[PDB]
Amino acid sequence: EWSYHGEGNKSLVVAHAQCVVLRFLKFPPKKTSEEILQHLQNIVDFGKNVMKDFLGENYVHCGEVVQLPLEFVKQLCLKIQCERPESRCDKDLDTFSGYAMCLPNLTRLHRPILCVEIKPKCGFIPFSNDVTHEMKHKVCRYCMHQHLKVATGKWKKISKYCPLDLYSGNKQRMHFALRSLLQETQNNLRIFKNGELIYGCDLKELAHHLKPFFFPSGPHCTKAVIRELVHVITRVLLSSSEKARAGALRLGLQPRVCEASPFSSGLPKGCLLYKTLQVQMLDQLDIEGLYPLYKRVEQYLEEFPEERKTLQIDGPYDEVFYQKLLDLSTEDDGTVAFALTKVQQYRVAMTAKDCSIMIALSPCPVIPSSRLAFSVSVLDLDLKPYESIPHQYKLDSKIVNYYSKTV
Numbered sequence: 530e531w532s533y534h535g536e537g538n539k540s541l542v543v544a545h546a547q548c549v550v551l552r553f554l555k556f557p558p559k560k561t562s563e564e565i566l567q568h569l570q571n572i573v574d575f576g577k578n579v580m581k582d583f584l585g586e587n588y589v590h591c592g593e594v595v596q597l598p599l600e601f602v603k604q605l606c607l608k609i610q611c612e613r614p615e616s617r618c619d620k621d622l623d624t625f626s627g628y629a630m631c632l633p634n635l636t637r638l639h640r641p642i643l644c645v646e647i648k649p650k651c652g653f654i655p656f657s658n659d660v661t662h663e664m665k666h667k668v669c670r671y672c673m674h675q676h677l678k679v680a681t682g683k684w685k686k687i688s689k690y691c692p693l694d695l696y697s698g699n700k701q702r703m704h705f706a707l708r709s710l711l712q713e714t715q716n717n718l719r720i721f722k723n724g725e726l727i728y729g730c731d732l733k734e735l736a737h738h739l740k741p742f743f744f745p746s747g748p749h750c751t752k753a754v755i756r757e758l759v760h761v762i763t764r765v766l767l768s769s770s771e772k773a774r775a776g777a778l779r780l781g782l783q784p785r786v787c788e789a790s791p792f793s794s795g796l797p798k799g800c801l802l803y804k805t806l807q808v809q810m811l812d813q814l815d816i817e818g819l820y821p822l823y824k825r826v827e828q829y830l831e832e833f834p835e836e837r838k839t840l841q842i843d844g845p846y847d848e849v850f851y852q853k854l855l856d857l858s859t860e861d862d863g864t865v866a867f868a869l870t871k872v873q874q875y876r877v878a879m880t881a882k883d884c885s886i887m888i889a890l891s892p893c894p895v896i897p898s899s900r901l902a903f904s905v906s907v908l909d910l911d912l913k914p915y916e917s918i919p920h921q922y923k924l925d926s927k928i929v930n931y932y933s934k935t936v
């Protein structure tokens with residue numbers, strides 16, 4: 530009755546054939562049942578108390594936490610193991626707790642429905658005066674990283690996608706980047722049709738499944754069937770129902786073009802990319818940067834460990850947590866309070882930098898112009914842990930220093 534639907538390293542999704550999925554956690558071969566509730570509960574809290582503000586009520590969809598029979602979680606886990614990539618069989622499924630989270634299936638909701646999930650990654654190159662390496666002001670994080678992934682053997686080759694192409698307003702750049710994602714999908718593009726993964730774990734094999742959409746006789750080459758996708762997706766990304774209202778974060782745009790991008794005024798105010806980009810800007814300092822402040826908070830919390838709970842570090846992510854994030858002032862007064870605020874803003878921006886966007890297309894409310902009804906949603910919105918900020922500091926040095934070798 531349930532089927533594998535995809536995963537990352539934090540969670541696993543399985544779809545109901547008869548329109549809801551289930552997000553299951555995944556640990557190695559260690560936590561308690563009490564612990565796992567709070568974690569999942571915080572993700573719900575965070576979503577509706579923080580992200581629902583930053584990205585709008587209809588973009589962020591959440592569903593409540595559920596409890597299920599423990600034998601039933603054992604009886605699904607064994608079936609799935611053949612479906613899961615060998616890469617992600619390092620970590621096992623959350624089988625013991627019996628808890629899971631139920632999100633509505635965006636792929637499903639007679640209706641032929643095409644779905645494009647993107648993991649756009651970071652849309653800006655850092656501007657902060659904390660950055661010690663020169664190359665970080667010229668090249669984006671994504672483009673530098675790509676090197677170390679291919680040298681590691683995570684992916685077979687370099688991607689020509691730069692996120693700044695996609696996060697720029699320009700349709701010609703946005704098309705190029707979308708073309709570049711289709712050539713090297715990696716974990717940045719997946720395409721679904723009627724609840725089924727049809728692309729990014731053959732350019733011409735895609736056109737077989739997409740011909741019935743954009744041309745419902747003939748004759749249309751793959752070049753045509755692919756170009757409509759690129760154009761439709763670009764229009765839906767430049768779509769907005771809120772060109773007027775003032776956002777929560779009014780962070781000013783500060784570089785517009787990456788040096789590494791092989792290609793050749795701004796994003797619409799209400800569009801999901803623009804709202805996603807603002808949340809990412811909360812990293813006003815760099816990690817270089819934010820890490821000194823992390824240690825300032827850390828040494829305080831080690832002096833006073835009961836403070837970790839009372840200062841809402843790992844929860845609750847409630848209406849007061851939200852309001853603390855609003856203080857944009859960047860000039861350091863040497864306090865814990867200042868250092869703590871920036872640590873929480875970074876974690877939030879860190880979560881906006883790893884999130885996926887789900888674009889649904891179906892004919893048939895709202896339309897790019899037969900004329901295709903569309904919805905736009907955002908995913909992977911659970912807060913990055915406080916504890917992982919040192920890992921991000923160390924990883925930042927490695928990407929830059931290795932890429933700097935390659936010049």
Ligand SMILES: O=P(O)(O)O[C@H]1[C@H](OP(=O)(O)O)[C@@H](OP(=O)(O)O)[C@H](OP(=O)(O)O)[C@@H](OP(=O)(O)O)[C@H]1OP(=O)(O)O
Binds near residue numbers: 537
């Ligand atoms: O497993 P990957 O496809 O390589 O993706 C990972 C993963 O994100 P997903 O689980 O959503 O796929 C990490 O997120 P966590 O699950 O650990 O929270 C994230 O790590 P951080 O947010 O801690 O940075 C990391 O991003 P990054 O590479 O920027 O460190 C990102 O990897 P890539 O996007 O680089 O593939």
Ligand SMILES: [Zn+2]
Binds near residue numbers: 669
């Ligand atoms: Zn780039």
